[PDB]
Each structure stands twice: as structure tokens, then as C-alpha cells.
Ligand binder design. Structure first.
Ligand SMILES: *Cc1c(COP(=O)(O)O)cnc(C)c1O
Ligand SMILES: [K+]
Ligand code: NA
Length: 431
């Protein structure tokens, strides 16, 4: 049973608490879209772990390549090159939009955004970084200073030159222009204010194609392009953080491709490692060449490490030959319709949004006032677990509890259905 007393005692005596609250179970194993506790209960992983496992848990391809390299090429001096590294770097150059040519293979999302930010500040000679009011880029220094969804208090000053403009949020609009929500005018409004505060050292703007932590907020039509132009006008770089949107989760290999707006630097992680610690940034040959002249430096233990690079190249291998980016739209629409049907049966569901296999459901006390559903959200999530469905709900002020649904890009038609079924039941029990 999950009640192992020795387990929870050790877990209580020797575990540092880092946010949230631990699941009252002991996950024994995982396969495909399921994790299993000590009793063997199958739990549908509707969050792909930490929004990472795009090929599902313990996927055969990955299990073999990892072992393959674990025993062949593992770790190397950070100045030695290998085929897995040059191949992944080259692949990424090829699957990312034209303009993105060079890659740096790292380990974490925060670490990758750090890399992009350091390179931007260097190349631009400036140091001010602008992000979204409800963004999330990591727990480390710069990634954390550009993160406004959570973690800014009780830990001292943020990084110097940290600004944030509101994120365009169509469901909860607050910027009107002609009786309509003008999120583009809201962009200009925001940046003017930015300019007024800027010390004249704006280096770049980090942005998530779809703000995940911030409640799955997809940037409206024309925003990305507009944003991109705002940055060019000020000689700023546009850093697109696709840690969760990258690698076909939204139905395109890269969300930035949807808008057709390629950034100056692109950072990848979560979905790129498919569960392992592999991350990377990709930039133009112009910026890289320049950053090089300025002596750019981002020397880590695991940068250009054989094993991770190999798994990453494999994750891209299968995602491609198995057209999971498409599986993402196919299964994403199945999940979406189902959610709309449930939204159709329950009033607490005020909104269903997102793209591809990164959907979001907002629980509200009532459509009319769109008043956040207090506790209900937590309850439904609680109920889902009992029913054997692993869900995740994020809660920010002035916004209802948002369920972040993101199963593997490998989910089956039935697995999707199973999920819908359990969610519907959970909502019935929560009310
Ligand atoms: C998850 C997340 C990260 C943080 O990456 P870590 O691997 O936890 O350091 C970075 N960017 C975005 C958009 C994320 O959602
Ligand atoms: K190394
Ligand atoms: Na490219």
C-alpha cells in the first residue's frame, strides 16, 4: 500500500519542501500515459509528468538510446565534441524556423533562459529585460527575475532592470478601445510606460507563446508579430520560451511557427528532454557570431554532453517519424470537443482554451461574473486523483482556477476518452 510508514517518515525527516504539496502516494512505475502507485493503481498522466514526457513515460526508443549511450558515450569535458551533440545541434538548426542556426545544449529551462538572457545582454550591451505579468521562466536568477506569475517576494531585490507588461488575456480583458478589447493598443500602452521607465538599456523581451503557469494564456492573433516589431523598434531581442509549447505540443513543431514569427533566440527544455534533463537555446548565426566576438560565456558541467544530446535527437526522431505534432492536433481536438461538451453540461466551466495538446479549463462560480471558483477547482483536482486521473490546477488572482491539461503527444483515442470520462465524474462529485 501507499501507506508505507518508513517511507513517509524518511520523506518527512529528509525532504526539503519546494512548493506545492506532495501526492499521498508512492509512484512505483510508469509506462505510456500511466504512472502506478504502490498498490498498482493506474493513474492517467494528464500533465505528462511536469509537462515534459511528450513520448509518454518510459518509451522504448528512449529506453534503448539512453542505455545505448549510457554505456558508450556518457559525459565529456565541456570542450570535446561528439556526434550526438553536433547532430542534435544541426537537427535543431533544421527543424526550427529559418533564422535560427546555432544551438547550445544545456540541462534546464531556467538554465536555458539564463543562457538566452546572458547572450542578449552581451550582444545588445544593454541589460533591461521585459516579460509578462504572469510569466514563468524558472527558479534561477534571471529566469526568476523575468518570472512574474510567482516567487518574487521574501527573497530580496529582483535583477536590476526588470519590467513586465500585462499579458494579452482575451477571457479576462481589461483594456478597452471602442467598446472592444484592444489587446494591441494595450501593447502600445504598455511599452510606452516601459519606455518611460527604461534607463535606455532595454536588452530583450522573454515570452512564452502560451503562458502555462499563468493559466494557459495564448497570445491573440497578431500579437506575436506586433510584439516582435516593438522589440525591433528598440533594438531589443525577442526571446521565445518554448519549454512547454515547443516540440509539437501545440500542434506545430514550434508555437512561434504558428504566428509565423521567428524570434532572435529560442529556448527549449521540458518537452525537448521528454523527461530527461536536456535543454537548449537556438539563435541566429549573426547573433552567435557577435556574441562570440564579445566573448560570450556559458560554461556548464553538462553542456554538450553525449547522453542528453543523444536522447534529445531521439525524441526529435520519433516525434517526426510518428508525426506526433499531428497526433497533437488530432488528439488535441478530441480532448477539446470533450471539454466543450463538459463545459456544456457544467456551469463551473467558464472557459476552455489553449492549442494542440496544451488545453486549459477555467473553473468559475458563474459564467456571468466570471468569479473565480473558490475551492471547487481544488476539489475537482482532488476528485480526479481519486478517480485515477492526474491533473494540475494553477490559481492566480483575479482569475479562476485553471486546469492545465497536457497528456503525452502519444495519448490514444481511448486514453483521451478515459480522461474526459473521469474529469466529468470528478466534476459531478465536486459540486
Ligand atoms: C517549466 C518552465 C521552465 C522552468 O524550467 P526548469 O527545467 O524547471 O528549470 C522554463 N520556462 C517555462 C515556460 C516553463 O513553463
Ligand atoms: K560537458
Ligand atoms: Na532554422
Amino acid at each position: 500500500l501507499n501507506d508505507d510508514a518508513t517511507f513517509w517518515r524518511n520523506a518527512r525527516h529528509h525532504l526539503v519542501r519546494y512548493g506545492g504539496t506532495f501526492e499521498p502516494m508512492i509512484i512505483e512505475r510508469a509506462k505510456g500515459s500511466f504512472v502506478y502507485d504502490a498498490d498498482g493503481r493506474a493513474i492517467l498522466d494528464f500533465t505528462s509528468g511536469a509537462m515534459s514526457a511528450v513520448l509518454g513515460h518510459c518509451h522504448p526508443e528512449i529506453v534503448s538510446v539512453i542505455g545505448e549511450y549510457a554505456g558508450k558515450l556518457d559525459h565529456l569535458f565541456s570542450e570535446m565534441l561528439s556526434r550526438p551533440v553536433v547532430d542534435l545541434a544541426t537537427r535543431l538548426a533544421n527543424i526550427t524556423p529559418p533564422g535560427l542556426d546555432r544551438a547550445l545544449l544545456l540541462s534546464t529551462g531556467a538554465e536555458s533562459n539564463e543562457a538566452a538572457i546572458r547572450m542578449a545582454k552581451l550582444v545588445t550591451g544593454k541589460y533591461e529585460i521585459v516579460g509578462f505579468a504572469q510569466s514563468w521562466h524558472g527558479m534561477t536568477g534571471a529566469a526568476a527575475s523575468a518570472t512574474y506569475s510567482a516567487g518574487r517576494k521574501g527573497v530580496g531585490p529582483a535583477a536590476v532592470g526588470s519590467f513586465a507588461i500585462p499579458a494579452p488575456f482575451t477571457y479576462r480583458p481589461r483594456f478597452e478601445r471602442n467598446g472592444a478589447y484592444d489587446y494591441l493598443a494595450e501593447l502600445d500602452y504598455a511599452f510606452d510606460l516601459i519606455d518611460r521607465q527604461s534607463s535606455g538599456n532595454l536588452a530583450a523581451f522573454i515570452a512564452e507563446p502560451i503562458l502555462s503557469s499563468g493559466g494557459i494564456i495564448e497570445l491573440p492573433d497578431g500579437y506575436m508579430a506586433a510584439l516582435k516589431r516593438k522589440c525591433e523598434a528598440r533594438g531589443m531581442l525577442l526571446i521565445l520560451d518554448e519549454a512547454q509549447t515547443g516540440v509539437g505540443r501545440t500542434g506545430t513543431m514550434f508555437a512561434c511557427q504558428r504566428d509565423g514569427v521567428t524570434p532572435d533566440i529560442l529556448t527549449l527544455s521540458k518537452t525537448l528532454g521528454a523527461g530527461l534533463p536536456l535543454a537548449a537555446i537556438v539563435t541566429s548565426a549573426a547573433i552567435e557570431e557577435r556574441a562570440h566576438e564579445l566573448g560570450y560565456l556559458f560554461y556548464t558541467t553538462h553542456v554538450s554532453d553525449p547522453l542528453p544530446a543523444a536522447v534529445g535527437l531521439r525524441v526529435l526522431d520519433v516525434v517526426q517519424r510518428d508525426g506526433l505534432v499531428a497526433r497533437a492536433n488530432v488528439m488535441g481536438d478530441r480532448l477539446r470537443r470533450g471539454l466543450l461538451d463538459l463545459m456544456e453540461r457544467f456551469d463551473c466551466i467558464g472557459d476552455v482554451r489553449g492549442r494542440g495538446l496544451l488545453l486549459g479549463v477555467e473553473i468559475v462560480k458563474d459564467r456571468r461574473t466570471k468569479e473565480p471558483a473558490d475551492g471547487l477547482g481544488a476539489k475537482i483536482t482532488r476528485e480526479c486523483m481519486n478517480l485515477g486521473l492526474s491533473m494540475n490546477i494553477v490559481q492566480l488572482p483575479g482569475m479562476g482556477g485553471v486546469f492545465r491539461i497536457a497528456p503525452p503527444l502519444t495519448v490514444s483515442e481511448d486514453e483521451i476518452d478515459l480522461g474526459l470520462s473521469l474529469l466529468g465524474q470528478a466534476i459531478e462529485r465536486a459540486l
